[PDB]
Amino acid sequence: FGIAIIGMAGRFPQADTVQAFWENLLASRECISFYSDEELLAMGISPEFVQHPDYVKAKGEVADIDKFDAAFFGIAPREAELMDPQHRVLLETAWAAFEDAGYVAADYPGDVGIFAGKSMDSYLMLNLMNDKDSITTTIAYHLNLRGPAITVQTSSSTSLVAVCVACQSLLTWQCDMAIAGGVTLGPPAKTGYLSQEGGITAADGHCRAFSDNSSGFVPGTGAGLVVLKRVDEALRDGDNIYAVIKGFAVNNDGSEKISYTAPSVDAQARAIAQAQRLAGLTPQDITYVEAHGTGTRLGDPVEFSALSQAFAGASQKQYCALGSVKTNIGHLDTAAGVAGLIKTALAVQQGIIPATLHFERPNAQIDLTNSPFYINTTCQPWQPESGIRRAGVTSLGMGGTNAHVVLEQAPAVDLQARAPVPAYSILPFSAKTDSALSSGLARFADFLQHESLPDRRDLAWTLSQGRKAFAHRAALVTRDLHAAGTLLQQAATAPFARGVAQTQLGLGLLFSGQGSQYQRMGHQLYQVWPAYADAFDRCATLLEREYQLDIRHELFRAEVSLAQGERLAQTCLTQPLLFSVEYALAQLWLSWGITPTVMIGHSLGEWVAATLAGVFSLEDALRLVARRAELMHQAPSGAMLMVALPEAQIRALITAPLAIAAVNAPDYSVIAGPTSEILAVSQRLTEQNIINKRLHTSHAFHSSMMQDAAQALRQAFENVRLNPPTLTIISTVTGAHVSADTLTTPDYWIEQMLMPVQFSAALQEAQATFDVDFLEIGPGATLTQLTNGHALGDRLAFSSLPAGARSSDEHKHILDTVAALWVRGHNIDLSAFAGEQPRRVSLPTYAFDKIRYWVDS
Amino acid sequence: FGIAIIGMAGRFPQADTVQAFWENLLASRECISFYSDEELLAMGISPEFVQHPDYVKAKGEVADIDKFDAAFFGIAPREAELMDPQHRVLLETAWAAFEDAGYVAADYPGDVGIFAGKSMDSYLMLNLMKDSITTTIAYHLNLRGPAITVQTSSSTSLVAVCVACQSLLTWQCDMAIAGGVTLGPPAKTGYLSQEGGITAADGHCRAFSDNSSGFVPGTGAGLVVLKRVDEALRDGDNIYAVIKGFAVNNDGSEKISYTAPSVDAQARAIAQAQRLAGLTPQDITYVEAHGTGTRLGDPVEFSALSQAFAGASQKQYCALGSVKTNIGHLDTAAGVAGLIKTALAVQQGIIPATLHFERPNAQIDLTNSPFYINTTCQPWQPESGIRRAGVTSLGMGGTNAHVVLEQAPAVDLQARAPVPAYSILPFSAKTDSALSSGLARFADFLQHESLPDRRDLAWTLSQGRKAFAHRAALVTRDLHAAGTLLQQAATAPFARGVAQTQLGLGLLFSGQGSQYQRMGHQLYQVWPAYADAFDRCATLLEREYQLDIRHELFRAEVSLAQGERLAQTCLTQPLLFSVEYALAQLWLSWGITPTVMIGHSLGEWVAATLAGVFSLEDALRLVARRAELMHQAPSGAMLMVALPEAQIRALITAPLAIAAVNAPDYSVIAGPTSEILAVSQRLTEQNIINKRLHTSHAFHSSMMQDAAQALRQAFENVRLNPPTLTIISTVTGAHVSADTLTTPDYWIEQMLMPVQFSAALQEAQATFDVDFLEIGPGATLTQLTNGHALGDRLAFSSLPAGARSSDEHKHILDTVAALWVRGHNIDLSAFAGEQPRRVSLPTYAFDKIRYWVD
C-alpha cells in the first residue's frame, strides 16, 4: 500500500504554481527577493531598520497576498477583508490542488479531509490597529469537505506533520481522500529580518544549506497543499500519482537535548529510521533526501549527523543525493515541509533532482566524501541502480518536532496497451466569471504550447470530470492539442464555442425530412458510437429480414458515386434509410443525456418523432415507413418548386387548385402537383422575376395526387397497435400541438401525406410555448437554416450532421454541436466523449480574480 | 481492539483534580461561580460593561491560573511569567495525568505523544499591555513521540483524543496523552449575553430544556492518557474506559451558513464512530452530548442523535447528558471534560445528573426517542453486562467528533496471590512544601474507604512516581492506619528526610552473642533470595553434620531450653553464619552495593565470603569446625567494662585478655570465670556499669590456642582468593590486603587478637563516610556505631532486637524505608506483590507560586 500524492498546489516565492516552482528549481533559480533601501520607505517600516548594518533586505515573498477572489467562494467583500490572507491563499491553493488532482472535492464520492497549518496570524496586528476564524474549517466550509478538518500546529514541521496526520486519517479510513499542507503569510510582504550575530537567520541574504559559508536561513513566505489518496484507490481511479508516501514518522526531541531551542541527532535519526521501517525500505534504497536544510550555524551538522546515523546501515558511499529547497525559496516556516515534499514528489515523478544552490564546499562539521550523501550544484537526472526513485523528506520544528516522509515512485501504469484515443475531443473550459475564463483559456494556451503535454483522452476527461462546470464557459473540438493551443492563443478571435450558460430545462428536436440525404450518412458515427450502431442495427436487422432492399450496404460500403448517390435519391430507399438515420441519431442524443421537450417533424420526421414518443413502436414504424415509401414510388412523377414568397401570397396567386407542399417560413414555400403543371407553368415566375429553385425530386409528395398511395396502405395501418404520446410532439400538418387522438388515429397519417406541412406555424408555436434551442436531427443543415432565419430571440438551432458534401466531417460536426450545446447550457454528459480507460492529469487550475481585499496599516 | 484510557487529569471549574470533579458530578453541584459588582470591579472589568444591563456575572472558573510550580520544571521566574497560563496549567495537568496513569513519562519503555489544544492566547494581551503547548509539555516531560497541537474550535480536546488514537492504532506511539485547555487572565469576568446569543442570559446551561438560553463560558484543563488496550491489559494499567471507535468529520457547506450546525454531519460522525467501534446504537446506553443549551444547537444535536440511533427498536433506553450543565462551556477543554466524565461514568457504573432539566425542549421529543435526560444521579446497569457510551464534541467551525467508549474488560480479582503482609509506601517531592501537602493529599485519600489493593498502591507509588529529593516512606499493613498515620505528619513517626546521593553503604556483620530463636523465619518464607542462600547453607551443614539448621529455627518449638540450646558455641557460629549470609544475599538482591563491610569476631568470615575470599561451601565447612573447637575449649567468661582501653590496661592481668574494643566506653574482657569474677568484684566498689555477656567460653582470650590448633590441621587446601570488596579488618583496625586476609594463620590470629571494632568503624567513617547497615539478629552493633563520630550518618539494623522477634518483616522493611529515604538505591519493586496493577492515587502537589506579567 501507501498514500499516493495525486495532486499538489502552492504559491511559492517567485512562483504561483507547482509548475512555476518546478521551472524555477530546474533553472536553479534563487527565488529570494532582494529589496532596495528606497523600496521600504513606502511600506510602513521604520527609517532606522533601513540604513542599519544588522538588517538584511531579503525574503522569499509570494506574489499577491492582498488579492483574493471572494466572489468565487461567495464571501462578501467585507468578510474577505477580515480574513487572514493565509486563509484566502490557502482557499485558492486548495481549490487549485483539487483541480490538479483532477477532482472537485465538493462532489467526490468518498470522504474528504483537510489537515493544514498556519503561521502567526499577523494580519490580526493591523486588523486591530479582535479575533478570527480557523483556516482548515474555512477550507472545509467553502469547498464542501466533509471529512476531518484538523488544524495541526507544530512549528516548522507543520506542513509535513499535516501530511503525516492526513496519511494516518487515510490509513485508518477516516477519509477517502485528503488534502494536507500549510501556509506562511503576513502583511509585511516586503520586509527584511535583522539577521543578528549568532542568530539562526542568514546575514548573507542567501540560505546556504550544508555549506561552509552558512550564516542561517532567509525567511520565505508561501503556501502549499498536497492531495492525498490511498494508492490502490488512486490506481483504480486513474489518478496522476506524483509519488507514493510509503512511510512516515513524527516524533519529538523531548529534553534529550541541551535546551528547548536545540536539535537532537537521535530524535531526527529516530524519525528517519522509523519512516524507512514503515516504508518497508532500507537506507540503501533512498537515493534522494530532502533535508530540512536550514543553513543555520548549529542545526546544519545536527541534521547531517542524524542522517548519517540513520543511513549508517548502508555501506555504499555517496549514493544518495541531499538537497534543500530553502536555498531556492527560503525557510518557508510552517509551509517548509510541503515545499520540500512538493519538490521531492515532483522529483520522484519527473525523475530529475534539482540543484541545491550556494554550495562549493561542505561544512566543517559535515563531511560528504565518507558519508552516503552528496549535494548537487546543478540539476541532475535521477536514475537509480534500484530502478525505483525512493526518496525522503525531513521537516523539523523549533519545539523539537521531527517529521520524516519516505516517497517511493509511483507504480508503472501500462498505457501503451490502452485502446486508441478517439479522433476528436471536446475541451470544456468553464469559469464563474468572464475574466477567469479569459485567463484560464490563456493558461491552457501557455500549457498547450509546450512540447510536453498530455493525452487527449487523459485531458478533456480531466477538463470535464475534474473541473466543476460554471456559467461562463467555452469548449473546443480538436484532434491535435497543439492546434488547441494555437486556437486558445488568439485572444477571443477564434471560432470555438463560447458564452454564458443559462439553465436550459429543455431542448427542441427538429426531426427533418427528405432533402439533404447523401452517400456516407452516419457511417462515421456508426463505428465510434455503440448506441448509434445498435439503433441503426435495430433498424437494419428488421429491414433485411423483412424486405429485399439492403440497409448498411447502401450507406456504408457502396462506393461514392452518382450511381449510388442517385440510387439513394429514389423514394423507396430515401424514406426508410433516412428514418433509420434520424432514429439512430435520436438514440445517440438520448444516450448523450438530452431531453427532447418538443419534437416536430417535416413530412417524415413526424414518423420518427412519433416513435420517440412511442405512439407506435420501432418495428411497426419501419414497416409503415417502408410500405409508405414503396406505395408512393409507383405514383406518377411530379416536381416541386421553391417559391420564396409568403403562403398567403402563394395561395392568392395559385394557378389551379393543387396542394401546397411545404410551408416553412414567411420567405419560403414549396408548391407541388403534376410535373407539367409545375415546370411548364413556373415560367410565369420569370415574368414575376422571382427565383424558383427545385428540390431534385421525381415524385409529388404532399400534393393532391397521392391519394391512392395512402388508399392502399389504409388497410395496412389498422392491424398494428398504437399508443398515446409520452413526449410533447406538436404536429406540423396542423401547425399546433398534439392531443391523444391526434396521433393514434390512422387516418391522420393518411391526410399527413396530402396536407402541406406548417413548419413555420409549428415553429412560431414551438418558440412561443417553449423558449428552447432547436437541435435538428437529420442528414444535413436543412431545418437549421430555416429555423435560424426565423424570429428566434436570443435562441439558436443546431444540426446533428454536416451539409452533405462534408460527409467526412460527421465526427467533427456532431461534436462541435455538442460543444455549442454544452456551452449554451445544456445537460450534455461530456464524460461520454473522452475515451476508453481515461486517467486524470495535471492541468492549469482556476484563474482566480486578483481583487484587493486589504484594510489599512 | 480499542484504545484504553488509562489515566486522566484536569483542573475544572470548582475542582482541582478529576476526583474533585467527579465528586461535583455525583453531588450534582453547579460549578458556575456567580460574582458581585464589587468582586468583578476589583478584578478590573470596566464599569461600562458591568453597568450594561445585558451582562451576566457568571463563569466556570479554574482556581489557580497564576500559580505555577516553575522550579519543578526547571523554569526561571521570568521564563515562567512569560508562559501562557494554559501552558503552565496543562504542564501540571500532564504531569498529573501521567501520575494518574501510573507512569513517569520520561521513563516509559516506548515513545509517548502529546496531542493537545489551547484557546486563543488571552495572556498575550497581558504580555503586550511563541512556545507551542505540546512541545513545551514534550520538553518538560521528556516526551519522545509526536507532539502535535491539534486545533479545532470546541471539538479540539476530543479531536485530539481521536488523533492520539490514530497514532496509537497505527503504532506511531506506544502510549499517548490528549486533551486541551481554556483559561486566561480574566479569571473573574462576565460575558455580556446579548439578544439571541449562544450564551445563557441567566448564567446556567439548562441544556436540552425549555428554559434554555445558551451556555455559560467555563474555563478548564483536561488530558487523558491513552494506550492500546492489549498493552494496557498486559502492563496492569487501570483502564477507565476503552475507546472502541471514533469519528471526526466536518459539516462542509451543507448548511445555511458557517455558524450553522448540521444534523447529517453529526449523525455521520455518531454512526461512523459506532461502526468503527463494531457496535450498534442499541448497545449505547449513555451519550455525552455536546449539549451547550443553545437555541439552534440542542434540536440539531438531538436530531442527529435520533437519526444515528434510529436503528434501535427500544424507547428511552439510552441516557443523555451534558457536563456543561455542571461546569459550563469549556470551549477547548469541552470534549475532554465530557470524555473524562463519561470515562469515569463508564468505569464506576454511575451516570451523573444533568442539571436544570425539567421539561424537554419544544423541538426535542424525548419520549419517542431513545434518550432520557437524568435529573438525579443514577447508577448504570444496562440490559447487557457492559456499559458502552458515546462522547460528542462539536466545533464552531463545523467539526464533529464522536467517541464510542466501552467498559474495560473484567479482570479476575480473586485470582491473584494475596497481598504481602507489609508494604513500603514511598512518597517523594522536589520540595518539603510539596512533600508535606502531598502527604496531606494521601491522608485525605486514605481517609476514604473501598481503598485500592495495598500491593497496587505500593506498586504505583514505587513504579509510577519519580523518586525525588525530599522523601518519606511508610511500612504499614492497613491503609486506614496509614491514613491516620499520614494525618499526623508534623509529629510523624515514619521515615522522612531529604535524600542525598549515598553512593556508599557499610555492612556491619554482627557479633556472636546477639541472636534469638526463630531468627530469619519471616524472611525465609517471604523472600526467595533468603531461602535460596539459607537453603544452600543449611544443605551443606546437614550434608555433613549431625545438626539441622532448618529445624533449630523454623520447625522446633519456642522454649527457654532451646533458647539457650541454639546458643551454645557449637551451634551458634554456623547458625549465625548461615543467617547472616542469607540476610546479605537478601540485601544484595534489593539493590544494595556494599562499599565497606566489616566483621565483629565472627562476621568477618561472612564479610570474606561475600567479598569472594571464600567460597560459601569451604567457609562453612570450617566455621562450624571452629565452633566445635571453641565449644571443646573448656570454660571462660566475658564481662563488659565501660571504660577506655588505655584505662583498661591498668587493671588487666596476664591470663585474662581484652576481647572486643567496640567503643571508647565499651570494652569486653575475656578470661577464666573466677578471675573475671574477682575483677568484677573489684569493679563493684568503683560504681561503674558492668555486666556479663551470658556466654561460657572466653573468645579472644588465653584459652584459644588449642582451639585454633586444629584449624591449622583443617583448611584442607581450600581454594582461597584475594578479596573483591573493601573489608576493613577488626583485628588490625584498618583495611586489609590481598594476602593479609587469606593466609591460613590470619584466621588463627583473628581467633585470638582483640576485636578493634571501634577502629574499623572510625577508619570506615573517615575513608568513606557511609551509612552503615548491620547484618545480624539485633541492634548491638547499631547503637555502638551511631554512638560514634558519624557526620550526618546513621547505622541501621536489619533484624529486630530479640524480644521483637515477630517484627522481622516490619523491621527490615522499615530499615529499607529509612535507607530509601536517606537516598540509597533500593529498588522498591521487589517489595510489591505478585502481579501488581497500577491504580489512581493523588498526584504531585505543586506549590502555588504566583507568576503574572500584569
> Residue B446 belongs to a domain with what CATH number?
3.30.70.3290
Question: Which residue in this structure is represented by grid cell 562450624?
Answer: B624
Q: Do the Cβ atoms of B438 and B394 come closer than 8 Å?
A: no
Euclidean distance between CA atoms A32 and A191, whole angstroms:
12
**Which residue has 427542441 as its cell numbers?**
A508
Look at residue A661 and give its three-state secondary structure.
Answer: strand
- Give yes or no: residues B721 and B742 share one domain: yes
Report how far residue A54's alpha carbon sits from residue A464's, in angstroms, rounded to the nearest whole number.
Answer: 54
**Helix, coil or strand: residue A392:** strand
Task: Specify whether B592 is located in the same domain as B616.
Answer: yes
Whether A472 is covered by a domain: the verdict is yes
How many whole angstroms separate alpha carbon B648 and alpha carbon B633? 25
Q: What is the DSSP string of A291-308?
A: ------TTTHHHHHHHHH
> DSSP letter string over B587-650?
HGGGT---SEEE-SSSHHHHHHHHHTSS-HHHHHHHHHHHHHHHHHS---EEEEE-S-HHHHTT
Q: Under a CB-based contact definition with an 8 Å cutoff, are residues B287 and B319 in contact?
A: yes
Strands of B495-498's sheet in order across: B423-429, B470-476, B495-498
B 230-249 residues inside an 8 A Cβ radius of A: 247-249
Q: Say which residues have a Cβ less than 8 Å from residue B493's Cβ, sequence separation at least 6.
A: B485
Residue with cell 530469619: B520
Closest CA to A443 of A485, A499, A387, A394: A485
Quick one: B604 and B638 in the same domain? Answer: no
> Residue A594 gets which letter from DSSP?
-
Measured CA angle at A556 (ends A555, A562), to 5 deg: 55
Domain carrying residue A833: 415-501+808-838
Q: Closest Cα of chain A to B132: distance in Å? A: 7
We report the CATH number of the domain holding residue B91 as 3.40.47.10
- Nearest CA to B422 among B488, B472, B461, B474? B474
Q: With contacts defined as CB-CB under 8 Å, which chain B residues touch A400?
A: 135, 138-139, 147
CATH of the domain at B721: 3.40.366.10
A542: helix, strand or coil: helix
Return the bridge partners of B7, or none: B225
Place of cell 521515615: B495
The residue of A95, A112, A121, A146 whose CB has the most chain B CBs within 10 angstroms, and thus the best one to mutate to test that interface, is A146
Whether A537 is in a domain gets the answer yes
Domain for residue A764, yes or no?
no
What is the H or E stretch that residue A464 is in? helix A461-465
Bridge-based pairing state of the strands A380-381 and A507-511: unpaired
Here the cell at position B599 is 566483621
Burial A33-60 (b: 16+ CB within 10 A, else e): bebeeeebeeeebeeebbeeeebbbbbb
- Evaluate whether B615 touches B592 at the Cβ level (below 8 Å): no
CA–CA distance, B220 with B20 (Å, rounded to integer): 13
Does residue A192 belong to the interface with chain B, where contact is any CB pair within 8 Å? no
All 3 cell numbers of residue A429? Answer: 473550459
Q: Do B138 and A399 touch (CB under 8 A)?
A: yes
Same-domain status, B36 and B70: yes
B127 touches chain A (CB under 8 A): no
| Residue B445, C-alpha cell as written in the block | 485519600
Q: Which of B450, B481, B498 is the last residue of a domain?
A: B498
Residue of A nearest to B256 (CA): A141
In contact, A575 and A628? CB cutoff 8 Å: yes
B-contacting residues in A 374-403 (Cβ below 8 Å)? 397-401
Which residues, 6+ apart, have CB-to-CB distance to B738 below 8 Å?
Answer: B722, B723
When divided into structural domains, chain B yields a total of 4
Q: Provide the grid cell at B339.
A: 470524555
Helix axes A571-591, A530-546, angle to 10 degrees: 150
Q: Residue B507 forms beta bridges with which residues? A: B597, B773
Boundary residue ending a domain (B498, B516, B547): B498
Q: What span, in angstroms and rounded, lies between the C-alpha atoms of B297 and B348?
A: 30
Pull the grid cell for residue A818: 455538442
Of A150, A255, A401, nearest to B150 by CB-CB distance is A150
- CA-to-CA distance for A644 and A638, rounded, in angstroms? 19
Q: How close is the nearest chain B Cα to the Cα of A62, in Å? A: 24
Domain co-membership, B570 together with B557: yes
Per the CB < 8 A criterion, the answer to whether A729 and A613 are in contact is yes
Residue of B nearest to A119 (CA): B130
Q: Exposed/middle/buried for A676, CB within 10 Å: 0-12, 13-18, 19+? A: exposed
Q: Are residues B342 and B307 in the same domain?
A: yes
Maximum pairwise Cα distance, chain A? 115
Going by C-beta distance under 8 Å and a sequence separation of 6 or more, which residues neighbour residue A488? Answer: A441, A442, A444, A445, A448, A476, A494
Can you tell me the distance from the alpha carbon of A778 to that of A771, in angstroms, rounded to the nearest whole number? Answer: 22
B414 inside domain: no
DSSP 8-state secondary structure symbol assigned to residue B275: H
- Reported residue count of chain B is 854
* CB nearest to B159's CB, from A150, A255, A270: A150
Backbone angles phi, psi at B284, to 5 degrees: -95, 105
Residue type at A47 in one-letter notation = P
Side-chain half-sphere exposure of A509, counting CA atoms within 13 A:
27
Q: Is B154 on the interface with A (CB under 8 A)?
A: no
Counting every residue written for chain A, the total comes to 857
Residue B844, domain member (yes or no): no
Count of A-B CB contacts under 8 Å: 175
CA distance B600 to B655: 23
Joined grid coordinates for residue A531: 448506441
Dist. CA B249–CA B270, nearest whole Å = 10
Neighbours of B127 (CB within 10 A): 14
Give the mutation candidate from B249, B263, B331, B393 for the A interface (greatest A CB count, under 10 A): B249
Reading the block at residue B159, the C-alpha cell is 479531536
Strand A149-151 with A58-59, pairing? unpaired
Number of helices and strands in chain B (H, E): 28, 26
**Chain B CB within 8 Å of residue A79 CB:** no
CA distance A102 to A104: 7
Resolution (A): 2.9
Q: Are B152 and A149 inside 8 Å of each other by CB?
A: yes
For A442-455, the three-class secondary structure string (H helix, E strand, C coil) is HHHHHHHCCCCCCC
Nearest to B619 by CA among B520, B740, B718, B534: B718
Give Cα separations from B486 to A261, B454, B466, B748 (angstroms): 42, 15, 20, 53
Rounded Cα gap, residues A667 and A671, in angstroms = 13
- Collapsed DSSP state (helix, strand, coil) of residue B779: coil
Q: Please report whether residue B625 resides in a domain.
A: yes
Residue A604 and residue A587: Cα distance in Å, rounded?
17
Tell me whether residue B854 is in a domain: no
CA angle A792, A796, A801 (to 5 degrees): 135
DSSP A556: I
Q: Which of A334, A335, A310, A307 is nearest to A323 (CA)?
A: A307
Is there a single domain that holds both residue B109 and residue B202? yes
Kindly compute the dihedral angle of the four CA atoms of residues A396, A398, A399, A402, in this order, to the nearest 10 degrees.
0
Angle at B57 between CA B53 and CA B63, to 5 degrees: 160
Structural domain includes residue A99: yes
What's the start-to-end Cα distance of chain B, in Å? 49
Kindly report the backbone phi and psi dihedral angles of residue A472, in degrees, each rounded to the nearest multiple of 5, phi listed first.
-70, 105
Residues A30 and A328: beta-carbon distance below 8 Å: yes
Torsional class of A134: left (φ above 0), alpha (ψ -120 to 50), beta (otherwise): beta
Instruction: For residue A120, give the chain B residue with the closest CA.
Output: B130
Sign for the pseudo-dihedral over CA of A288, A293, A299, A301:
positive
User: What are the cell numbers at B476?
Assistant: 504499614
Angstrom distance (rounded) from CA B408 to CA B833: 23
In terms of domains, do A467 and A604 share one?
no
Instruction: List the Cα angle A606/A609/A612 in 5-degree steps.
Output: 155
The closest of A410, A394, A295, A431 to A351, measured between CA atoms, is A410
A476 in the same domain as A461: yes
* SS3 assignment, position B483: helix
DSSP at B329: B
- Specify whether B203 is located in the same domain as B278: yes
For residues B605 and B586, what is the distance between their CA atoms, to the nearest angstrom? 17
| Alpha-carbon separation of residue A354 from A75, A380, A382, B277, B473 (angstroms) | 39, 6, 9, 47, 64
Across A361-457, the runs of DSSP E, i.e. the strands, are 373-375, 380-381, 390-396, 401-409, 425-431
Are β-strands A58-59 and A112-118 bridged in parallel, bridged antiparallel, or unpaired?
unpaired
Which of A475, A567, A599, A525 shows the shortest CA–CA distance to A802?
A: A525
Classify residue A351 as left (phi > 0), alpha (psi -120 to 50) or beta: left
| Continuous segment of H or E residues that includes residue A182 | strand A177-184
Give residue for cell 445537460. Answer: A827
The answer for A506, left when phi > 0, alpha when psi is -120 to 50, beta otherwise, is left
Among left, alpha and beta (phi > 0; psi -120 to 50; other), residue B293 is left
Chain breaks in chain B following residues, C–N > 2.5 Å: 129
Q: Does A513 touch chain B (CB under 8 A)?
A: no
- What is the spatial distance between Cα B757 and Cα B687, in angstroms, rounded to a whole number? 26
Q: Rounded to a whole number, what is the distance in Å from the CA of A400 to chain B's nearest CA?
A: 7
Are residues B743 and B795 part of one domain? yes
Tell me, yes or no, if A151 comes closer than 8 A to chain B by beta carbon: yes
Q: What is d(CA A588, CA A538) in angstroms, rounded to the nearest whole number?
A: 13
Pairing of strands B284-288, B388-394: parallel
Which of A75, A150, A173, A230 to probe by mutation at the B interface, max B CB count within 10 Å?
A150
Strands (E), B633-756: 637-641, 657-663, 666-671, 690-692
User: Is the distance from CB of B672 to CB of B656 less than 8 angstroms?
Assistant: yes
User: CB contact, 8 Å: A282 with chain B?
Assistant: no
Distances (CA, A) of B721 to B581, B611, B613, B710, B724: 18, 9, 4, 22, 9
Chain A interface includes B142 (CB < 8 A): yes
For residue B322, what is its C-alpha cell? 451534558
DSSP conformation class of B397: T
Please state, in angstroms and rounded to a whole number, the distance separating the CA atoms of residues B337 and B344.
11
Is A694 in a helix, a strand, or coil?
Answer: coil
Closest Cα in chain A, distance from residue B157 (Å): 12
| Cell numbers given for B680 | 568484677
Asked if the Cβ–Cβ distance from B250 to A143 is below 8 Å, we say: no
User: Which residues of chain A are within 8 Å of residue B248 when distances are taken between CB atoms?
Assistant: 147-148, 150, 174
Within 10 Å of residue B36's Cβ, how many Cβ atoms? 10
Neighbours of A841 (CB within 10 A): 21
Q: What's the number of CA atoms in the CB half-sphere (13 Å) around residue B18?
A: 31
Please tell me if residue A135 touches chain B, with a CB cutoff of 8 Å: no
Contacts 24+ apart (CB under 8 A), B49-52: B49/B190, B49/B192, B50/B190, B52/B192
Which cell goes with A37? 533601501
DSSP state of A220: B
Q: Which of A13, A394, A465, A381 is nearest to A207 (CA)?
A: A13
Q: Given A394, A409, A424, which residue is the final one in a domain? A: A409
Tell how strand B399-407 and strand B423-429 pair up: unpaired
For chain A, the residues before each gap (C–N > 2.5 Å) are 129
Question: What CA–CA distance (Å, rounded) separates A327 from A355?
Answer: 9
Whether residues A518 and A644 share a domain: the answer is: no
Contacts of A156 (CB under 8 A, 6+ apart): A292, A331, A333, A334, A336, A337, A395, A396, A397, A398
Contact A662, A603 (CB under 8 A): yes
Please give the DSSP secondary-structure letter assigned to residue B352: P
The answer to whether the Cβ–Cβ distance between A400 and B138 falls below 8 Å is yes
What is the domain-level CATH number for residue B688? 3.30.70.250
Quick check: B465 and B842 in contact, CB under 8 A? Answer: no
Listed in sequence order, the DSSP H helices in A143-288 are 158-171, 231-236, 265-278
Q: Residue B132: CB partners within 8 Å, gap ≥ 6?
A: A153, A154, A155, A397, A399, B149
Minimum-distance CB partner of A149 among B141, B166, B399: B399
In angstroms, how far is CA B800 from the centroid of its own chain?
27
